[PDB]
Amino acid sequence: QDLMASGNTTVKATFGKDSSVVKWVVLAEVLVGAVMYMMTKNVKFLAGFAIISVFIAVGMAVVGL
Amino acid sequence: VVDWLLPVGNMLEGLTAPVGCSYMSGTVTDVITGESIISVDAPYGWTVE
Ligand SMILES: CCOP(=O)(O)OC[C@H](O)CO
């Protein structure tokens, strides 16, 4: 038989690549990384401009329904 | 001979009339036979079936 835990495709369309999660995680870096030049003012927080698309691909393509 | 057949003639007419009966304890059998194909448911996706 089937299962009762899924069968609605609700969490897949909400927490996925083609949803709204990828938009709320791309603006959080510029909200704090682009304003920390007051006290620090050093080239340090620049290694996060490429790991955003990588972390979302190594976690969503694990199962894939 | 005709006057002698008074008790004998009455028995031949009594064995033809319907006589009531009294029950005791009857049996009602319940036997079921069949199959069931199933357608189981489915689942888813796947495819194949
Ligand atoms: C050089 C790129 O930045 P980081 O690797 O964060 O530098 C480590 C030290 O804080 C240098 O001051």
PDB file of C-alpha atoms and ligand atoms in Angstrom:
ATOM      1  CA  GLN A   1       0.000   0.000   0.000  1.00  0.00           C
ATOM      2  CA  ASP A   2       0.922   3.690   0.071  1.00  0.00           C
ATOM      3  CA  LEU A   3       1.657   5.977   3.029  1.00  0.00           C
ATOM      4  CA  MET A   4      -0.235   8.637   4.970  1.00  0.00           C
ATOM      5  CA  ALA A   5       2.755  10.853   5.837  1.00  0.00           C
ATOM      6  CA  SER A   6       2.869  12.393   2.343  1.00  0.00           C
ATOM      7  CA  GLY A   7       0.886  12.303  -0.897  1.00  0.00           C
ATOM      8  CA  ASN A   8       0.115  16.036  -1.055  1.00  0.00           C
ATOM      9  CA  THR A   9       3.317  17.634  -2.460  1.00  0.00           C
ATOM     10  CA  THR A  10       3.009  20.494   0.037  1.00  0.00           C
ATOM     11  CA  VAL A  11       6.407  20.604   1.763  1.00  0.00           C
ATOM     12  CA  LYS A  12       8.191  20.046  -1.565  1.00  0.00           C
ATOM     13  CA  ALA A  13       6.714  23.193  -3.133  1.00  0.00           C
ATOM     14  CA  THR A  14       7.396  25.223   0.043  1.00  0.00           C
ATOM     15  CA  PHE A  15      10.932  24.153   1.051  1.00  0.00           C
ATOM     16  CA  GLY A  16      12.698  23.689  -2.261  1.00  0.00           C
ATOM     17  CA  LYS A  17      14.711  25.347  -4.996  1.00  0.00           C
ATOM     18  CA  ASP A  18      11.783  26.774  -6.995  1.00  0.00           C
ATOM     19  CA  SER A  19      10.118  28.246  -3.903  1.00  0.00           C
ATOM     20  CA  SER A  20      10.633  31.145  -1.483  1.00  0.00           C
ATOM     21  CA  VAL A  21      13.387  29.671   0.714  1.00  0.00           C
ATOM     22  CA  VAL A  22      16.125  30.599  -1.775  1.00  0.00           C
ATOM     23  CA  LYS A  23      15.091  34.270  -1.566  1.00  0.00           C
ATOM     24  CA  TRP A  24      15.099  34.618   2.235  1.00  0.00           C
ATOM     25  CA  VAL A  25      18.618  33.124   2.465  1.00  0.00           C
ATOM     26  CA  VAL A  26      20.260  35.378  -0.147  1.00  0.00           C
ATOM     27  CA  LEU A  27      19.395  38.715   1.514  1.00  0.00           C
ATOM     28  CA  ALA A  28      20.523  37.705   5.018  1.00  0.00           C
ATOM     29  CA  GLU A  29      24.202  37.856   4.014  1.00  0.00           C
ATOM     30  CA  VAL A  30      24.094  41.407   2.639  1.00  0.00           C
ATOM     31  CA  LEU A  31      22.053  42.513   5.666  1.00  0.00           C
ATOM     32  CA  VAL A  32      24.959  41.857   8.052  1.00  0.00           C
ATOM     33  CA  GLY A  33      28.022  41.259   5.848  1.00  0.00           C
ATOM     34  CA  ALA A  34      27.786  44.577   4.005  1.00  0.00           C
ATOM     35  CA  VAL A  35      27.343  46.612   7.217  1.00  0.00           C
ATOM     36  CA  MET A  36      30.164  45.168   9.360  1.00  0.00           C
ATOM     37  CA  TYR A  37      32.668  47.629   7.836  1.00  0.00           C
ATOM     38  CA  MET A  38      32.164  49.928  10.845  1.00  0.00           C
ATOM     39  CA  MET A  39      34.119  48.112  13.572  1.00  0.00           C
ATOM     40  CA  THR A  40      36.079  45.542  11.534  1.00  0.00           C
ATOM     41  CA  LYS A  41      36.580  47.054   8.047  1.00  0.00           C
ATOM     42  CA  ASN A  42      38.563  44.114   6.682  1.00  0.00           C
ATOM     43  CA  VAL A  43      38.262  41.740   3.733  1.00  0.00           C
ATOM     44  CA  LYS A  44      37.023  38.645   5.570  1.00  0.00           C
ATOM     45  CA  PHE A  45      33.314  37.982   4.952  1.00  0.00           C
ATOM     46  CA  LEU A  46      33.729  37.351   1.228  1.00  0.00           C
ATOM     47  CA  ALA A  47      33.670  33.527   1.118  1.00  0.00           C
ATOM     48  CA  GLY A  48      29.855  33.357   1.117  1.00  0.00           C
ATOM     49  CA  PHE A  49      29.157  34.679  -2.399  1.00  0.00           C
ATOM     50  CA  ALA A  50      29.365  31.194  -3.950  1.00  0.00           C
ATOM     51  CA  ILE A  51      28.404  28.720  -1.211  1.00  0.00           C
ATOM     52  CA  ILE A  52      24.722  29.701  -1.395  1.00  0.00           C
ATOM     53  CA  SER A  53      23.963  27.855  -4.638  1.00  0.00           C
ATOM     54  CA  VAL A  54      26.175  24.929  -3.571  1.00  0.00           C
ATOM     55  CA  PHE A  55      24.545  24.245  -0.194  1.00  0.00           C
ATOM     56  CA  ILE A  56      21.067  24.310  -1.757  1.00  0.00           C
ATOM     57  CA  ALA A  57      22.099  21.757  -4.408  1.00  0.00           C
ATOM     58  CA  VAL A  58      23.787  19.223  -2.095  1.00  0.00           C
ATOM     59  CA  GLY A  59      20.690  18.955   0.110  1.00  0.00           C
ATOM     60  CA  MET A  60      17.684  19.155  -2.197  1.00  0.00           C
ATOM     61  CA  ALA A  61      18.962  16.605  -4.745  1.00  0.00           C
ATOM     62  CA  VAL A  62      19.549  13.957  -2.058  1.00  0.00           C
ATOM     63  CA  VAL A  63      16.201  12.135  -2.212  1.00  0.00           C
ATOM     64  CA  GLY A  64      14.168  13.898  -4.890  1.00  0.00           C
ATOM     65  CA  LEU A  65      10.858  12.142  -4.191  1.00  0.00           C
TER      66      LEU A  65
ATOM     67  CA  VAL B   1     -76.808 -56.211   9.839  1.00  0.00           C
ATOM     68  CA  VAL B   2     -77.639 -52.533   9.285  1.00  0.00           C
ATOM     69  CA  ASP B   3     -78.307 -51.960  12.994  1.00  0.00           C
ATOM     70  CA  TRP B   4     -75.036 -53.707  13.896  1.00  0.00           C
ATOM     71  CA  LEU B   5     -72.925 -51.315  11.785  1.00  0.00           C
ATOM     72  CA  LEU B   6     -73.610 -48.371  14.123  1.00  0.00           C
ATOM     73  CA  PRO B   7     -70.257 -48.416  16.001  1.00  0.00           C
ATOM     74  CA  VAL B   8     -68.396 -49.679  12.922  1.00  0.00           C
ATOM     75  CA  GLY B   9     -69.872 -47.115  10.532  1.00  0.00           C
ATOM     76  CA  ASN B  10     -68.978 -44.261  12.879  1.00  0.00           C
ATOM     77  CA  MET B  11     -65.289 -45.234  12.814  1.00  0.00           C
ATOM     78  CA  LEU B  12     -65.083 -45.101   9.010  1.00  0.00           C
ATOM     79  CA  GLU B  13     -66.428 -41.527   9.033  1.00  0.00           C
ATOM     80  CA  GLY B  14     -64.141 -40.360  11.851  1.00  0.00           C
ATOM     81  CA  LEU B  15     -60.916 -41.455  10.169  1.00  0.00           C
ATOM     82  CA  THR B  16     -61.614 -39.153   7.195  1.00  0.00           C
ATOM     83  CA  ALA B  17     -62.299 -35.882   9.032  1.00  0.00           C
ATOM     84  CA  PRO B  18     -59.312 -33.589   9.694  1.00  0.00           C
ATOM     85  CA  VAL B  19     -57.950 -34.032  13.223  1.00  0.00           C
ATOM     86  CA  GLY B  20     -55.914 -31.339  14.935  1.00  0.00           C
ATOM     87  CA  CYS B  21     -52.364 -31.933  16.112  1.00  0.00           C
ATOM     88  CA  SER B  22     -50.015 -30.608  18.790  1.00  0.00           C
ATOM     89  CA  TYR B  23     -46.376 -29.702  18.194  1.00  0.00           C
ATOM     90  CA  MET B  24     -43.451 -30.552  20.466  1.00  0.00           C
ATOM     91  CA  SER B  25     -40.001 -29.269  19.464  1.00  0.00           C
ATOM     92  CA  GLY B  26     -39.047 -28.608  15.851  1.00  0.00           C
ATOM     93  CA  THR B  27     -35.598 -28.252  14.305  1.00  0.00           C
ATOM     94  CA  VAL B  28     -34.615 -25.413  11.957  1.00  0.00           C
ATOM     95  CA  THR B  29     -31.441 -26.271  10.045  1.00  0.00           C
ATOM     96  CA  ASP B  30     -29.208 -23.380   8.950  1.00  0.00           C
ATOM     97  CA  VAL B  31     -26.636 -24.428   6.331  1.00  0.00           C
ATOM     98  CA  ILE B  32     -24.877 -21.827   4.173  1.00  0.00           C
ATOM     99  CA  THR B  33     -22.674 -22.627   1.174  1.00  0.00           C
ATOM    100  CA  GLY B  34     -20.710 -20.201  -0.964  1.00  0.00           C
ATOM    101  CA  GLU B  35     -17.365 -18.684  -1.850  1.00  0.00           C
ATOM    102  CA  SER B  36     -15.787 -15.225  -1.739  1.00  0.00           C
ATOM    103  CA  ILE B  37     -13.459 -14.068  -4.529  1.00  0.00           C
ATOM    104  CA  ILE B  38     -11.490 -10.934  -3.661  1.00  0.00           C
ATOM    105  CA  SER B  39      -8.832  -6.457  -6.702  1.00  0.00           C
ATOM    106  CA  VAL B  40      -5.704  -5.850  -3.503  1.00  0.00           C
ATOM    107  CA  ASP B  41      -5.450  -1.840  -4.352  1.00  0.00           C
ATOM    108  CA  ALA B  42      -2.716  -0.854  -7.052  1.00  0.00           C
ATOM    109  CA  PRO B  43       0.074   1.346  -5.463  1.00  0.00           C
ATOM    110  CA  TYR B  44       1.774   4.330  -7.293  1.00  0.00           C
ATOM    111  CA  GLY B  45       3.543   4.593 -10.714  1.00  0.00           C
ATOM    112  CA  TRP B  46       4.546   0.980 -11.635  1.00  0.00           C
ATOM    113  CA  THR B  47       3.584  -0.842 -14.935  1.00  0.00           C
ATOM    114  CA  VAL B  48       2.732  -4.484 -16.009  1.00  0.00           C
ATOM    115  CA  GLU B  49      -0.528  -6.221 -14.785  1.00  0.00           C
TER     116      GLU B  49
HETATM  117  C1  LIG C   1      42.036  36.932   4.027  1.00  0.00           C
HETATM  118  C2  LIG C   1      40.554  36.566   3.867  1.00  0.00           C
HETATM  119  O1  LIG C   1      39.904  36.833   5.055  1.00  0.00           O
HETATM  120  P1  LIG C   1      40.031  35.743   6.325  1.00  0.00           P
HETATM  121  O2  LIG C   1      40.465  34.458   5.733  1.00  0.00           O
HETATM  122  O3  LIG C   1      38.828  35.932   7.195  1.00  0.00           O
HETATM  123  O4  LIG C   1      41.377  36.350   7.159  1.00  0.00           O
HETATM  124  C3  LIG C   1      41.726  35.736   8.347  1.00  0.00           C
HETATM  125  C4  LIG C   1      42.295  36.816   9.299  1.00  0.00           C
HETATM  126  O5  LIG C   1      41.298  37.431  10.045  1.00  0.00           O
HETATM  127  C5  LIG C   1      43.077  37.866   8.470  1.00  0.00           C
HETATM  128  O6  LIG C   1      43.032  39.064   9.192  1.00  0.00           O
END
